From a paper:
To characterize the nature of the substrate-binding site in AnCDA, we determined the crystal structure of the enzyme to 2.0 Å resolution. The structure shows the expected (β/α)8 barrel topology as well as a CE4 active site architecture, including the His-His-Asp metal-binding triad (H97, H101, D48), a catalytic acid (His196, aiding sugar departure) and a catalytic base (Asp47, activating the nucleophilic water), similar to the active site of ClCDA9. Despite the fact that no metals were added in the crystallization solution, there is clear evidence for a metal ion bound to the His-His-Asp triad, with a peak >14 σ in the 2Fo-Fc map. The ion, refined as cobalt, adopts an octahedral coordination in which the other three ligands are a bidentate phosphate molecule from the crystallization solvent and a water. The phosphate ion in AnCDA occupies the position where the acetyl-group of the to-be-deacetylated sugar, i.e. the sugar bound in subsite 0, is located. Interestingly, AnCDA (and ClCDA) have a lysine (Lys164 in AnCDA) within hydrogen-bonding distance to the sugar bound in subsite +1, creating a positively charged environment. This could reduce the affinity for deacetylated sugars in this subsite as the amino group of such a sugar carries positive charge. Another interesting feature of the AnCDA structure is the presence of a cluster of large aromatic residues on the surface of the protein near the catalytic centre and the −1 subsite. This cluster is composed of Tyr53, which is a phenylalanine in ClCDA and tyrosine in all three putative A. nidulans deacetylases, and Tyr200 and Trp201, which are unique to AnCDA.
We have cloned a similar chitin deacetylase (EAA66447) from Aspergillus nidulans FGSC A4 and carried out an extensive characterization of the recombinant enzyme, with an appended short N-terminal His-tag, produced in E. coli. Combining mass spectrometry and analyses of acetate release, it was shown that AnCDA catalyses mono-deacetylation of (GlcNAc)2 and full deacetylation of (GlcNAc)3–6 in a non-processive manner. AnCDA seems to have broader substrate specificity than other characterized members of the CE4 family and the enzyme seems well suited to act on chitin and its partially deacetylated forms.
Author numbering: 27 to 237
Write the structure that this text describes.
Amino acid sequence: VPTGQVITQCTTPNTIALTFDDGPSEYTPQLLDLLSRYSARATFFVLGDAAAQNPGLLQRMRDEGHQVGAHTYDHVSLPSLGYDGIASQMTRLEEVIRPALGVAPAYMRPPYLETNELVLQVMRDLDYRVISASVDTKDYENQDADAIINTSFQLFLDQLDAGGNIVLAHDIHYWTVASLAERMLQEVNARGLIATTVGDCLGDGEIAWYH
Ligand SMILES: [Cl-]
Ligand SMILES: [Co+2]
Ligand code: NA
Ligand code: NA
């Protein structure tokens, strides 16, 4: 799996990577229970303060077969920073994850999906795989019981049908965990799909998901 190169598509047949940004949050526990119910493994791209404050959730993620990835400490668009600012965004997050897991993610997702050549260079240098998305649910814009189905689920089905398989949602949001995640899992199960972690969907052994 190359480092410092935008990845948007799984490479394993019949897999889909449900991925959740900006946590962990107060809704993460209900989301993990829901995932285990469907034997589904997901990927959580986590933030600095949320990770510092929630080392138990990180551990529940790993213990339960999920992948913890990096989402920067402060959620700042990385093309806005110079070499040292990008680097510090990643290393400050590593230093708050390592005490919880004993290791740090070697996969990350750029905030707002924004990259440029400089951020990919830093990610190559820090040994990160850079995960974007091919199914964007826009769940953060659709936080209402009708919107989250009308648009976010609809977007999910339309992009899934078009062959998209790295699904972006945010487990910080109530309606994502209360309504969208259940609808996406029912769809996974109905179709014949394997919901697994981003690393596994890319043919990477679990050992390579951390460094
Ligand atoms: Cl629908
Ligand atoms: Co984010
Ligand atoms: Na790709
Ligand atoms: Na635990």
